[PDB]
Amino acid sequence: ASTSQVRQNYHQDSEAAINRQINLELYASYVYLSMSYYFDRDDVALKNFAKYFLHQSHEEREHAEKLMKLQNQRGGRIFLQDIKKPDCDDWESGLNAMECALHLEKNVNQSLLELHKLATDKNDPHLCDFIETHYLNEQVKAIKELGDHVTNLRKMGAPESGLAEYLFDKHTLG
Amino acid sequence: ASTSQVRQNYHQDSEAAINRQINLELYASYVYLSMSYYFDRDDVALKNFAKYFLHQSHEEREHAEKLMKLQNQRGGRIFLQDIKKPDCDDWESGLNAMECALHLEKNVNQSLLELHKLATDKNDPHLCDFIETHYLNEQVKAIKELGDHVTNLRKMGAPESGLAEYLFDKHTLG
Amino acid sequence: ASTSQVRQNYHQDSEAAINRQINLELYASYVYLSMSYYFDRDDVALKNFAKYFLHQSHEEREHAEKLMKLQNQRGGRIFLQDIKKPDCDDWESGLNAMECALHLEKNVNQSLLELHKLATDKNDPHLCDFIETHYLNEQVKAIKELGDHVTNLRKMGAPESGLAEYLFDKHTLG
Amino acid sequence: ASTSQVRQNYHQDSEAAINRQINLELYASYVYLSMSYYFDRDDVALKNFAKYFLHQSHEEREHAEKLMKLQNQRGGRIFLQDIKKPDCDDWESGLNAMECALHLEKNVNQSLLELHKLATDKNDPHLCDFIETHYLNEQVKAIKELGDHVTNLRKMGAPESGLAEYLFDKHTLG
Amino acid sequence: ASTSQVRQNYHQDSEAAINRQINLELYASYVYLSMSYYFDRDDVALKNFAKYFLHQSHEEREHAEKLMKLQNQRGGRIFLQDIKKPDCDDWESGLNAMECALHLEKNVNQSLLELHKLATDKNDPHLCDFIETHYLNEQVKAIKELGDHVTNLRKMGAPESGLAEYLFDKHTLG
Amino acid sequence: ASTSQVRQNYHQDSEAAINRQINLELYASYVYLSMSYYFDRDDVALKNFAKYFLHQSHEEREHAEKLMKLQNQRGGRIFLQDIKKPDCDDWESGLNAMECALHLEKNVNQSLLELHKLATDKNDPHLCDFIETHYLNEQVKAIKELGDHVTNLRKMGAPESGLAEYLFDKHTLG
Ligand SMILES: [Cl-]
Ligand SMILES: [Cl-]
Ligand SMILES: [Cl-]
Ligand SMILES: [Cl-]
Ligand SMILES: [Cl-]
Ligand SMILES: [Cl-]
Ligand SMILES: [Cl-]
Ligand SMILES: [Cl-]
Ligand SMILES: [Cl-]
Ligand SMILES: [Cl-]
Ligand SMILES: [Cl-]
Ligand SMILES: [Cl-]
Ligand SMILES: [Cl-]
Ligand SMILES: [Cl-]
Ligand SMILES: [Cl-]
Ligand SMILES: [Cl-]
Ligand SMILES: [Cl-]
Ligand SMILES: [Cl-]
Ligand SMILES: [Cl-]
Ligand SMILES: [Cl-]
Ligand SMILES: [Cl-]
Ligand SMILES: [Cl-]
Ligand SMILES: [Cl-]
Ligand SMILES: [Cl-]
Ligand SMILES: [Cl-]
Ligand SMILES: [Cl-]
Ligand SMILES: [Cl-]
Ligand SMILES: [Cl-]
Ligand SMILES: [Mg+2]
Ligand SMILES: [Mg+2]
Ligand SMILES: [Mg+2]
Ligand SMILES: [Mg+2]
Ligand SMILES: [Mg+2]
Ligand SMILES: [Mg+2]
Ligand SMILES: [Mg+2]
Ligand SMILES: [Mg+2]
Ligand SMILES: [Mg+2]
Ligand SMILES: [Mg+2]
Ligand SMILES: [Mg+2]
Ligand SMILES: [Mg+2]
Ligand SMILES: [Mg+2]
Ligand SMILES: [Mg+2]
Ligand SMILES: [Mg+2]
Ligand SMILES: [Mg+2]
Ligand SMILES: [Mg+2]
Ligand SMILES: [Mg+2]
Ligand SMILES: [Mg+2]
Ligand SMILES: [Mg+2]
Ligand SMILES: [Mg+2]
Ligand SMILES: [Mg+2]
Ligand SMILES: [Mg+2]
Ligand SMILES: [Mg+2]
Ligand SMILES: [Mg+2]
Ligand SMILES: [Mg+2]
Ligand SMILES: [Mg+2]
Ligand SMILES: [Mg+2]
Ligand SMILES: [Mg+2]
Ligand SMILES: [Mg+2]
Ligand SMILES: [Mg+2]
Ligand SMILES: [Mg+2]
C-alpha cells in the first residue's frame, strides 16, 4: 500500500494514464493481428499485406511492453484491463484495411499527445522525454507511411481494381 | 456467405471450437505477460522469473497465430472475442506464479483434449494430426516443467524463504 | 485545399515558421559556399579554409532537406522563396570569415529558439523534440567551434599575420 | 583591383558569362530540390521520383561548384546573385515534373551553347574545352534521358493513369 | 568580465545551477569511492560490492565532466567548490551501503528536476534537452537498479545473514 | 576497535600519514581537472592542453585508489576529508598552468619524501618499497616533464606569444 522506494515526481494521474496507454497499445496489436489474417484468407490471398500487418502487430506488443517497463521503472503499479476485439469493421479490401490502420494510428497519437500534456501539467520531464523519444516520432512516421499507402492504392484504382491491390502487394509491401 | 473453395471435411462445430481455442491461447499469452512484469517490480526484483514468463507469453502468441493460420488453411472464418484480463489473483511469490501457470497450462490442455475429441467425433484426421503434432506434446512438456519448478521451489522452502526464490531465479531460470 | 490525411496537432503558424527556417538553412548553405571559394582564390590560397567552409555548406543543405521532410511528415506544404545572396561583406581574411560564420550560426540559433517557443506555445511536443534532437545541440557545438577558431586566430596574431592564418589552416583545419 | 597574377587570355565578358552560368546551375539545383519533395508529399507518395530528382539536384550543385573552381583557376572573380525560387508551376504529376525538367535542361544547354559561342569569339580554347568536356555531353545525355522518361509516361497513359506513374516509379526509377 | 562570444539564451541563474550540479556529481563520485573501499576491508571482504561501487564512482566523475563541458559550450564559467567528505555514516553492511546509494541517487535526481524546472522557467530548450538526454533516464535506471538490489538483500535475510550478502555478491554483482 | 587480523609492523602514525597522502592525491586530481576545463573555454581554446591535464587528473585518482588499497592491505582504516577546491589562482595562460602543475608535483613529492622518512623511522620496509616502487620515480618523471614543458614555452615566447602556446599545443601535446 505504502509508497514504492523508487517513486519520485510520478503523479497518480500519470500512473493511471500510462495503464490506459498500455491497454491501447495491446488493442492496436490485436487490430493489426486481425487485419493480418484477413489477407491470409483463401478468398483475399494477399500475402505481403498479411506480413505487413503481422509485423505492425508485433511492433505494438513491443510498444506495450516498453510502457509496462516504464511503469515499474517509475514505481507505479501495472493495472491491466480486457483487450477489446477489433472495432473497425469487416476488412473488405487492402485499401479499407490501410484506412482503418491510418485512423487507429491517429487515435493512438491523440492518446499520446494527451499523455504528454498531462506529464507537462505535472512537471514530469522524465515522462515527457520518454514519450517524445520512444513514441511521438514513431507515430508521425507510421501515420505518414499509411497515408502514402492509402494514396498509392487510391491512385492505382483500388478497391475496384483487384489488379491494383495485387501489384501494390508485390511492389510496395514485397 | 457461400462455401470457401478450399473447405473439405471441416465441420462448423470444429470451426467454432478452433475460434474458442484462439481466444484461450491469447488469454494465456496475457496471463504470462502480467506475471512477467510482476517480477520486474522494484519490490519483487527477480529478473529471470520475469524473462521466463515473457518467453512463455511470446510462445502462446505463436500458438494463437498457428491456429489462425489453420482456420484459413481449412476455409473456416476467424471470429475474435475480447481477451479477458488475467484472473489467477495478485501474484504474491515466484511459487504462487508457478502454481498459477501450472493450473493455466492444465486448463489449456483440457481445452485441447476436448477439441481433439470433437475432431475425432467428426472424423477429421487432418485436425486430429494438427492438434497432436503442434499442441499435445508441447502441453505435456510445459506441464511437466512447471511441476518440476513448483517441486523445487517447495523443497527449497518457498514462499517464506526469499533466499530460495533468489537462488532458484539464478540456478534454474538463469 | 482540404486537410492532409496525416495532419494532426500541426498549427498553421508552425507550418509557416518551418518554411521560413527552410529558407534560412538554404541561405546559410549559400553563405558558406561563397566563403569556401573565397579561400580558393589565387590571392588568398588557404585550401583547408576552403574545404572547411564547403563541408559546412553541404551540412546546411542537409539541415534544409531534413526540414522539408518534416514539413511533409506532418502534412504541411512546402513554400519556397528566393535564396538571397550572402550579405556578410567582402571576406577579407580567415579571421573575418570565421567571425561572419559565428554571427550566421548565432542568428540561425535565435531563429530555431523562436521556432521552439512557437511549438511550445502551440503544445506541439513532436516539433519541440524534432528541433531539440536534430538542431539545438548542433547549433551549440557549431557556435562553440567557431568561437574556438576565432580565439586561436586572434591569439596567433590574425589578420595582420599571414603566417598565423597559414599555420591555423595547416594545424587546425588540416 | 589590378590583374590576377594567373589571368591569361580570359576575357571580362567570359568572366561575367561564367558568373551567370553559376547562378543558372544553382537555380537548376533548386528546381530539382522542389520537384523532389513534391513526390515525398503524403498525397503524391512516389518515393523513386523523389530520389531521382534529389540526385539531379545534388548533380546541379556539383556543376555550380566546378564553375566556381574554373572562375578562380582562370583568375576571374566570383559574383553571386540571389537564387530565384522555382518557376515551372505546381508540379501536378510525375509526367508534368519530367516535362518541366526537360524544358529546364534544354534552357541550361542553350545557355552553355551561348557561353561556348562567346569563348569561340574570344579565342579561348581552354574555356571551349572546359565546356565541351564537363558540360555539353552531360546536357545531351540528361535531355535524352528525360525525353525517354516523358515518352514512357505518355505511352503508359500518364497523367490520368495513377497506375502508370506508380509502375514507372518502380520499374524505371527503382 | 564582458560576455562570452558564444553565449546565447543562457541565464546567469542556469550557469550558477550547473556549477552547483557539478559539485553534487563530484560529491556522488566521492561517496561511491568511500563505499567501494569499505567492501575491500579485510573484515568485510565482498570484492563484487567493491567493484560495483568503484564503477559507480567512475560514472559520477564522467557525469561531472559532461557538465563542465556543457558550461563551456554555453559560454558560462566553471566555479568549483570543496568536495565534501561522504555523510551517509559508517557503512555497516552491503544492505546499508545500497540504501545510502538509493538515497544519494534520489537526492541527485531531485537536484536535476529542480535544474530542469529552472531551465523551463528561463525558456532554455537546449539545457532542458541536455538534462533529459544525458541525466534524467540515467537517474531513473540507477534508482530502479538500487531498489531492486535493496529488495533482494532484504528478501535474502540481510543484514543479519552474512551468507545472504556473500551470495548476492557472487550472483548479482559477480 | 580491536586490531585488524592482518595488521603487522604498521605504525598508527604511518596509517594516519597514508590517509593524509590519499587526500593530497585527490586534491591533485581536482587541480588538474580545473586546469583541463580552463583550456576548453571558448576564449582559451587549446584542446591538447585540455586533454593533457585531464589525463593527469585521471592518473592522480588512480594514485589515490592505490593508497586506499594499500591502507586496507596493511589493515589500516581509511579516513577521508573534504577535497579542497584548487588554490593555484586564475589559470591565465598555458605557461602559468604548467608552472602551477610543476609546483603541485614538487609539493606532492615533498609529502611522499616525508612519508618515506616516517616509514624509515618506523622500520616499515614494505611501506618504503611501496612508496619507492609506485610513487617516487613517477614524481621525478612528472617533475622533469613539466620542467621541460615550462622551458619550451618560455623559449618559444609564452605567455605574450599566443602563437607560441598554439604551436606547443600542436607539436608537444598533440
Ligand atoms: Cl507525493
Ligand atoms: Cl490505473
Ligand atoms: Cl476489464
Ligand atoms: Cl524521421
Ligand atoms: Cl458439408
Ligand atoms: Cl465462432
Ligand atoms: Cl467479445
Ligand atoms: Cl518429449
Ligand atoms: Cl549458490
Ligand atoms: Cl553459480
Ligand atoms: Cl484544426
Ligand atoms: Cl508559408
Ligand atoms: Cl521569393
Ligand atoms: Cl555535445
Ligand atoms: Cl588584357
Ligand atoms: Cl559578373
Ligand atoms: Cl541578386
Ligand atoms: Cl555518351
Ligand atoms: Cl518486378
Ligand atoms: Cl542577456
Ligand atoms: Cl556559480
Ligand atoms: Cl568551497
Ligand atoms: Cl530505459
Ligand atoms: Cl603493536
Ligand atoms: Cl587518520
Ligand atoms: Cl574534512
Ligand atoms: Cl625512468
Ligand atoms: Cl609549425
Ligand atoms: Mg483505452
Ligand atoms: Mg508500426
Ligand atoms: Mg503503438
Ligand atoms: Mg464488445
Ligand atoms: Mg528521436
Ligand atoms: Mg474461452
Ligand atoms: Mg510454453
Ligand atoms: Mg498455448
Ligand atoms: Mg472482467
Ligand atoms: Mg510430435
Ligand atoms: Mg528568413
Ligand atoms: Mg556545421
Ligand atoms: Mg543549419
Ligand atoms: Mg539583394
Ligand atoms: Mg520538452
Ligand atoms: Mg541530442
Ligand atoms: Mg541567369
Ligand atoms: Mg543530371
Ligand atoms: Mg547543370
Ligand atoms: Mg520572384
Ligand atoms: Mg574546338
Ligand atoms: Mg567527353
Ligand atoms: Mg551542492
Ligand atoms: Mg551509475
Ligand atoms: Mg550523476
Ligand atoms: Mg565537514
Ligand atoms: Mg534518452
Ligand atoms: Mg593534506
Ligand atoms: Mg602524471
Ligand atoms: Mg600523485
Ligand atoms: Mg576554501
Ligand atoms: Mg621502479
PDB file of N, CA and C in Angstrom, chain C residues 40-97:
ATOM      1  N   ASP C  40      39.743  29.746 -52.061  1.00  0.00           N
ATOM      2  CA  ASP C  40      40.256  29.064 -53.267  1.00  0.00           C
ATOM      3  C   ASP C  40      40.853  30.082 -54.238  1.00  0.00           C
ATOM      4  N   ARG C  41      40.685  31.385 -54.003  1.00  0.00           N
ATOM      5  CA  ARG C  41      41.229  32.381 -54.941  1.00  0.00           C
ATOM      6  C   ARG C  41      42.754  32.308 -54.925  1.00  0.00           C
ATOM      7  N   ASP C  42      43.389  32.596 -56.050  1.00  0.00           N
ATOM      8  CA  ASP C  42      44.872  32.532 -56.142  1.00  0.00           C
ATOM      9  C   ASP C  42      45.550  33.575 -55.233  1.00  0.00           C
ATOM     10  N   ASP C  43      44.860  34.651 -54.842  1.00  0.00           N
ATOM     11  CA  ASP C  43      45.418  35.696 -53.956  1.00  0.00           C
ATOM     12  C   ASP C  43      44.975  35.506 -52.511  1.00  0.00           C
ATOM     13  N   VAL C  44      44.427  34.344 -52.154  1.00  0.00           N
ATOM     14  CA  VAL C  44      44.042  34.023 -50.739  1.00  0.00           C
ATOM     15  C   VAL C  44      44.694  32.689 -50.406  1.00  0.00           C
ATOM     16  N   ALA C  45      44.340  31.646 -51.160  1.00  0.00           N
ATOM     17  CA  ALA C  45      45.099  30.380 -51.307  1.00  0.00           C
ATOM     18  C   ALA C  45      45.246  29.681 -49.951  1.00  0.00           C
ATOM     19  N   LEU C  46      44.149  29.564 -49.214  1.00  0.00           N
ATOM     20  CA  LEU C  46      44.134  28.732 -47.979  1.00  0.00           C
ATOM     21  C   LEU C  46      43.193  27.537 -48.176  1.00  0.00           C
ATOM     22  N   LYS C  47      43.715  26.420 -48.673  1.00  0.00           N
ATOM     23  CA  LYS C  47      42.883  25.286 -49.126  1.00  0.00           C
ATOM     24  C   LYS C  47      42.076  24.633 -48.000  1.00  0.00           C
ATOM     25  N   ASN C  48      42.533  24.642 -46.736  1.00  0.00           N
ATOM     26  CA  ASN C  48      41.793  23.970 -45.639  1.00  0.00           C
ATOM     27  C   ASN C  48      40.665  24.863 -45.136  1.00  0.00           C
ATOM     28  N   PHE C  49      40.832  26.179 -45.182  1.00  0.00           N
ATOM     29  CA  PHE C  49      39.681  27.099 -45.014  1.00  0.00           C
ATOM     30  C   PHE C  49      38.648  26.791 -46.076  1.00  0.00           C
ATOM     31  N   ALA C  50      39.059  26.666 -47.316  1.00  0.00           N
ATOM     32  CA  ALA C  50      38.103  26.403 -48.402  1.00  0.00           C
ATOM     33  C   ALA C  50      37.364  25.084 -48.129  1.00  0.00           C
ATOM     34  N   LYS C  51      38.067  23.992 -47.801  1.00  0.00           N
ATOM     35  CA  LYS C  51      37.412  22.678 -47.559  1.00  0.00           C
ATOM     36  C   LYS C  51      36.493  22.792 -46.326  1.00  0.00           C
ATOM     37  N   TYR C  52      36.942  23.459 -45.268  1.00  0.00           N
ATOM     38  CA  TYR C  52      36.162  23.556 -44.011  1.00  0.00           C
ATOM     39  C   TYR C  52      34.783  24.194 -44.328  1.00  0.00           C
ATOM     40  N   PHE C  53      34.815  25.336 -45.012  1.00  0.00           N
ATOM     41  CA  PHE C  53      33.534  26.039 -45.315  1.00  0.00           C
ATOM     42  C   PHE C  53      32.696  25.266 -46.341  1.00  0.00           C
ATOM     43  N   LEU C  54      33.281  24.559 -47.305  1.00  0.00           N
ATOM     44  CA  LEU C  54      32.467  23.751 -48.239  1.00  0.00           C
ATOM     45  C   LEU C  54      31.737  22.673 -47.458  1.00  0.00           C
ATOM     46  N   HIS C  55      32.429  21.999 -46.536  1.00  0.00           N
ATOM     47  CA  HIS C  55      31.775  20.958 -45.718  1.00  0.00           C
ATOM     48  C   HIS C  55      30.594  21.585 -44.962  1.00  0.00           C
ATOM     49  N   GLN C  56      30.788  22.745 -44.360  1.00  0.00           N
ATOM     50  CA  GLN C  56      29.734  23.474 -43.611  1.00  0.00           C
ATOM     51  C   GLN C  56      28.581  23.787 -44.562  1.00  0.00           C
ATOM     52  N   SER C  57      28.877  24.183 -45.799  1.00  0.00           N
ATOM     53  CA  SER C  57      27.833  24.471 -46.808  1.00  0.00           C
ATOM     54  C   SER C  57      26.957  23.216 -47.050  1.00  0.00           C
ATOM     55  N   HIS C  58      27.601  22.075 -47.256  1.00  0.00           N
ATOM     56  CA  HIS C  58      26.934  20.782 -47.539  1.00  0.00           C
ATOM     57  C   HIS C  58      26.073  20.397 -46.315  1.00  0.00           C
ATOM     58  N   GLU C  59      26.562  20.648 -45.099  1.00  0.00           N
ATOM     59  CA  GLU C  59      25.808  20.322 -43.843  1.00  0.00           C
ATOM     60  C   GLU C  59      24.515  21.157 -43.780  1.00  0.00           C
ATOM     61  N   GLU C  60      24.558  22.444 -44.143  1.00  0.00           N
ATOM     62  CA  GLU C  60      23.358  23.332 -44.120  1.00  0.00           C
ATOM     63  C   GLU C  60      22.338  22.841 -45.149  1.00  0.00           C
ATOM     64  N   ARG C  61      22.746  22.385 -46.354  1.00  0.00           N
ATOM     65  CA  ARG C  61      21.791  21.836 -47.344  1.00  0.00           C
ATOM     66  C   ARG C  61      21.118  20.611 -46.726  1.00  0.00           C
ATOM     67  N   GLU C  62      21.857  19.754 -46.005  1.00  0.00           N
ATOM     68  CA  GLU C  62      21.237  18.594 -45.300  1.00  0.00           C
ATOM     69  C   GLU C  62      20.222  19.089 -44.255  1.00  0.00           C
ATOM     70  N   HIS C  63      20.551  20.157 -43.524  1.00  0.00           N
ATOM     71  CA  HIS C  63      19.626  20.713 -42.497  1.00  0.00           C
ATOM     72  C   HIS C  63      18.331  21.185 -43.178  1.00  0.00           C
ATOM     73  N   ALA C  64      18.435  21.803 -44.354  1.00  0.00           N
ATOM     74  CA  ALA C  64      17.241  22.257 -45.111  1.00  0.00           C
ATOM     75  C   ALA C  64      16.417  21.048 -45.543  1.00  0.00           C
ATOM     76  N   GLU C  65      17.056  20.026 -46.117  1.00  0.00           N
ATOM     77  CA  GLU C  65      16.340  18.824 -46.594  1.00  0.00           C
ATOM     78  C   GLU C  65      15.545  18.142 -45.471  1.00  0.00           C
ATOM     79  N   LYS C  66      16.135  18.076 -44.263  1.00  0.00           N
ATOM     80  CA  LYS C  66      15.501  17.405 -43.096  1.00  0.00           C
ATOM     81  C   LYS C  66      14.235  18.191 -42.697  1.00  0.00           C
ATOM     82  N   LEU C  67      14.268  19.519 -42.846  1.00  0.00           N
ATOM     83  CA  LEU C  67      13.043  20.336 -42.543  1.00  0.00           C
ATOM     84  C   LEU C  67      12.001  20.182 -43.636  1.00  0.00           C
ATOM     85  N   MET C  68      12.394  20.030 -44.885  1.00  0.00           N
ATOM     86  CA  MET C  68      11.436  19.727 -45.958  1.00  0.00           C
ATOM     87  C   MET C  68      10.793  18.345 -45.767  1.00  0.00           C
ATOM     88  N   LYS C  69      11.563  17.358 -45.316  1.00  0.00           N
ATOM     89  CA  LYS C  69      10.999  16.043 -44.924  1.00  0.00           C
ATOM     90  C   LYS C  69       9.979  16.208 -43.786  1.00  0.00           C
ATOM     91  N   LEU C  70      10.322  16.971 -42.755  1.00  0.00           N
ATOM     92  CA  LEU C  70       9.469  17.174 -41.546  1.00  0.00           C
ATOM     93  C   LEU C  70       8.140  17.794 -42.011  1.00  0.00           C
ATOM     94  N   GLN C  71       8.235  18.830 -42.840  1.00  0.00           N
ATOM     95  CA  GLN C  71       7.012  19.519 -43.358  1.00  0.00           C
ATOM     96  C   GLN C  71       6.051  18.495 -43.963  1.00  0.00           C
ATOM     97  N   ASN C  72       6.522  17.668 -44.898  1.00  0.00           N
ATOM     98  CA  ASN C  72       5.721  16.560 -45.467  1.00  0.00           C
ATOM     99  C   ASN C  72       5.288  15.525 -44.416  1.00  0.00           C
ATOM    100  N   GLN C  73       6.167  15.133 -43.491  1.00  0.00           N
ATOM    101  CA  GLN C  73       5.790  14.097 -42.487  1.00  0.00           C
ATOM    102  C   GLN C  73       4.566  14.578 -41.692  1.00  0.00           C
ATOM    103  N   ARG C  74       4.515  15.886 -41.407  1.00  0.00           N
ATOM    104  CA  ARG C  74       3.419  16.475 -40.573  1.00  0.00           C
ATOM    105  C   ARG C  74       2.224  16.915 -41.418  1.00  0.00           C
ATOM    106  N   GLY C  75       2.309  16.837 -42.737  1.00  0.00           N
ATOM    107  CA  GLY C  75       1.177  17.176 -43.614  1.00  0.00           C
ATOM    108  C   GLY C  75       1.066  18.658 -43.930  1.00  0.00           C
ATOM    109  N   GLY C  76       2.134  19.401 -43.686  1.00  0.00           N
ATOM    110  CA  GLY C  76       2.276  20.795 -44.114  1.00  0.00           C
ATOM    111  C   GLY C  76       2.688  20.842 -45.564  1.00  0.00           C
ATOM    112  N   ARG C  77       2.671  22.023 -46.163  1.00  0.00           N
ATOM    113  CA  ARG C  77       3.016  22.164 -47.590  1.00  0.00           C
ATOM    114  C   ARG C  77       4.220  23.079 -47.685  1.00  0.00           C
ATOM    115  N   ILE C  78       5.266  22.590 -48.362  1.00  0.00           N
ATOM    116  CA  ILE C  78       6.497  23.380 -48.528  1.00  0.00           C
ATOM    117  C   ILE C  78       6.221  24.613 -49.399  1.00  0.00           C
ATOM    118  N   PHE C  79       6.725  25.767 -48.971  1.00  0.00           N
ATOM    119  CA  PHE C  79       6.618  27.029 -49.737  1.00  0.00           C
ATOM    120  C   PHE C  79       8.021  27.604 -49.750  1.00  0.00           C
ATOM    121  N   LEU C  80       8.580  27.711 -50.938  1.00  0.00           N
ATOM    122  CA  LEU C  80       9.970  28.129 -51.142  1.00  0.00           C
ATOM    123  C   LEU C  80       9.999  29.609 -51.532  1.00  0.00           C
ATOM    124  N   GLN C  81      11.071  30.271 -51.137  1.00  0.00           N
ATOM    125  CA  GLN C  81      11.319  31.674 -51.505  1.00  0.00           C
ATOM    126  C   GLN C  81      12.698  31.757 -52.134  1.00  0.00           C
ATOM    127  N   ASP C  82      13.002  32.874 -52.775  1.00  0.00           N
ATOM    128  CA  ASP C  82      14.375  33.112 -53.303  1.00  0.00           C
ATOM    129  C   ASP C  82      15.408  32.866 -52.174  1.00  0.00           C
ATOM    130  N   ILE C  83      16.570  32.353 -52.549  1.00  0.00           N
ATOM    131  CA  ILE C  83      17.719  32.263 -51.619  1.00  0.00           C
ATOM    132  C   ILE C  83      18.565  33.504 -51.848  1.00  0.00           C
ATOM    133  N   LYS C  84      18.586  34.388 -50.867  1.00  0.00           N
ATOM    134  CA  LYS C  84      19.301  35.673 -51.005  1.00  0.00           C
ATOM    135  C   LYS C  84      20.813  35.447 -51.144  1.00  0.00           C
ATOM    136  N   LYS C  85      21.509  36.246 -51.955  1.00  0.00           N
ATOM    137  CA  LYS C  85      22.980  36.166 -51.989  1.00  0.00           C
ATOM    138  C   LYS C  85      23.527  36.530 -50.614  1.00  0.00           C
ATOM    139  N   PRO C  86      24.734  36.032 -50.289  1.00  0.00           N
ATOM    140  CA  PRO C  86      25.323  36.338 -48.994  1.00  0.00           C
ATOM    141  C   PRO C  86      25.520  37.836 -48.742  1.00  0.00           C
ATOM    142  N   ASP C  87      25.197  38.229 -47.519  1.00  0.00           N
ATOM    143  CA  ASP C  87      25.271  39.622 -47.008  1.00  0.00           C
ATOM    144  C   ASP C  87      26.686  39.875 -46.464  1.00  0.00           C
ATOM    145  N   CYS C  88      27.009  39.333 -45.286  1.00  0.00           N
ATOM    146  CA  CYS C  88      28.291  39.486 -44.517  1.00  0.00           C
ATOM    147  C   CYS C  88      29.207  40.647 -44.984  1.00  0.00           C
ATOM    148  N   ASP C  89      29.802  40.578 -46.191  1.00  0.00           N
ATOM    149  CA  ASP C  89      30.672  41.627 -46.826  1.00  0.00           C
ATOM    150  C   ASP C  89      31.745  40.940 -47.696  1.00  0.00           C
ATOM    151  N   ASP C  90      32.770  41.671 -48.196  1.00  0.00           N
ATOM    152  CA  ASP C  90      33.973  41.001 -48.780  1.00  0.00           C
ATOM    153  C   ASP C  90      34.735  40.360 -47.632  1.00  0.00           C
ATOM    154  N   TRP C  91      35.202  39.151 -47.887  1.00  0.00           N
ATOM    155  CA  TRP C  91      35.554  38.205 -46.815  1.00  0.00           C
ATOM    156  C   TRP C  91      36.818  38.630 -46.078  1.00  0.00           C
ATOM    157  N   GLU C  92      37.772  39.272 -46.783  1.00  0.00           N
ATOM    158  CA  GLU C  92      38.982  39.981 -46.258  1.00  0.00           C
ATOM    159  C   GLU C  92      40.062  39.051 -45.699  1.00  0.00           C
ATOM    160  N   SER C  93      39.698  38.097 -44.846  1.00  0.00           N
ATOM    161  CA  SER C  93      40.710  37.291 -44.099  1.00  0.00           C
ATOM    162  C   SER C  93      40.062  36.006 -43.567  1.00  0.00           C
ATOM    163  N   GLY C  94      40.886  35.028 -43.159  1.00  0.00           N
ATOM    164  CA  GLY C  94      40.355  33.841 -42.456  1.00  0.00           C
ATOM    165  C   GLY C  94      39.615  34.234 -41.180  1.00  0.00           C
ATOM    166  N   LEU C  95      40.180  35.152 -40.416  1.00  0.00           N
ATOM    167  CA  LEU C  95      39.517  35.601 -39.170  1.00  0.00           C
ATOM    168  C   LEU C  95      38.155  36.241 -39.478  1.00  0.00           C
ATOM    169  N   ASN C  96      38.079  37.128 -40.446  1.00  0.00           N
ATOM    170  CA  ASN C  96      36.820  37.844 -40.736  1.00  0.00           C
ATOM    171  C   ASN C  96      35.782  36.844 -41.214  1.00  0.00           C
ATOM    172  N   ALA C  97      36.157  35.856 -42.028  1.00  0.00           N
ATOM    173  CA  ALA C  97      35.181  34.851 -42.468  1.00  0.00           C
ATOM    174  C   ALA C  97      34.685  34.101 -41.219  1.00  0.00           C
TER     175      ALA C  97
END
